[PDB]
Design a protein around this ligand. Structure first.
Ligand SMILES: Nc1ncnc2c1ncn2[C@@H]1O[C@H](COP(=O)(O)OP(=O)(O)O)[C@@H](O)[C@H]1O
Ligand SMILES: [Zn+2]
Ligand SMILES: [Zn+2]
Ligand SMILES: [Zn+2]
Ligand SMILES: [Zn+2]
Ligand SMILES: [Zn+2]
Length: 213
C-alpha cells in the first residue's frame, strides 16, 4: 500500500493517487507503522531505537502496540496524550468515573472522599506509586513502575488497580457512616450485580469474595 506520512519526502507525496472530484525524512527501504490511537502512519524506527536510545519511544512497553505521541505528538478527540511515562500519563478528567469496579456508587464515594480533602486523581496516583515502589501496592502487570512508558489503556488498567488499593486503605472513620454501614456483598469486588444501581447502593463492594465461614 502507498503511504505518505508527516515525515515523508515531497516526491512521495505528489505521486499518490489524486482525490476524486464531483528533522527525520523517510528513506526508501524504511517502513511505516500506524498509531494505535489516531490510526495515522509514522516511520517505524523501533528497530533503530533498540540500538539508539536517542530515538523517541514508539510503542507501549506493556502491550507493545505502536503509538505516535512521544515521537511527534498525537492529535485526536478522545486522545489525552496516548503514550507517556506512567507517572506523567494523562488519564483524562473523567478517569474517576467508574474507576472502582465499574461501579458508579463506589466510585462516587471515592470522588467525594478526595473532593472533601481537596485531592485530585493526580495526588492519589502519586501516593499510590510510592506504595507501589515499596511493594506495598501490587499490579497485575507486575513489572510496571511509575517510569514505565505505557499507553492510555494500559495506564488506565493499572490506575484502576492502584486506585482500588488506595480506596481499600482508607479508614472506615474517614468515610460517611452511610458508606460503612452497608454489609459486604458475598461476591466481593468482582460481583456482576454491582452495575445495577440498587445492589450497588445496598452492599459494600470494596471487599473480597466470601469463601469459607
Ligand atoms: N443477596 C445477597 N447478595 C450479596 N451478598 C449478600 C446477600 N445476602 C447476604 N449477603 C452478604 O454475604 C455475607 C455473608 O453472609 P451470610 O453468608 O448470610 O453469613 P452471616 O450469617 O455470617 O452474615 C454478608 O456480608 C452479607 O452481607
Ligand atoms: Zn513517511
Ligand atoms: Zn499499552
Ligand atoms: Zn497517534
Ligand atoms: Zn493518541
Ligand atoms: Zn454484589
Amino acid at each position: 500500500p502507498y503511504v505518505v506520512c508527516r515525515q515523508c519526502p515531497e516526491y512521495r507525496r505528489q505521486a499518490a493517487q489524486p482525490p476524486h472530484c464531483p528533522d527525520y525524512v523517510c528513506p526508501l527501504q524504511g517502513s511505516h507503522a500506524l498509531c494505535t490511537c489516531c490510526f495515522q502512519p509514522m516511520p517505524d524506527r523501533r528497530v533503530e531505537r533498540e540500538q539508539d536510545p536517542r530515538v523517541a519511544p514508539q510503542q507501549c512497553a506493556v502491550c507493545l502496540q505502536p503509538f505516535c505521541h512521544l515521537y511527534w505528538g498525537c492529535t485526536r478527540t478522545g486522545c489525552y496524550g496516548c503514550l507517556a511515562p506512567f507517572c506523567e500519563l494523562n488519564l483524562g478528567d473523567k478517569c474517576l468515573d467508574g474507576v472502582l469496579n465499574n461501579n458508579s456508587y463506589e466510585s462516587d464515594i471515592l470522588k467525594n472522599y478526595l473532593a472533601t480533602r481537596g485531592l485530585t486523581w493526580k495526588n492519589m496516583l502519586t501516593e499510590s506509586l510510592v506504595a507501589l515502589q515499596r511493594g506495598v501496592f501490587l499490579l497485575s502487570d507486575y513489572r510496571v513502575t511509575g517510569d514505565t512508558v505505557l499507553c492510555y489503556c494500559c495506564g488506565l488498567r493499572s490506575f484502576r488497580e492502584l486506585t482500588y488499593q488506595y480506596r481499600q486503605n482508607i479508614p472506615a472513620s474517614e468515610l460517611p457512616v452511610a458508606v460503612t454501614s452497608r454489609p459486604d456483598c458475598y461476591w466481593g469486588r468482582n460481583c456482576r450485580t454491582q452495575v445495577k444501581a440498587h445492589h450497588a447502593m445496598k452492599f459494600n463492594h470494596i471487599c473480597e469474595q466470601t469463601r469459607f465461614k
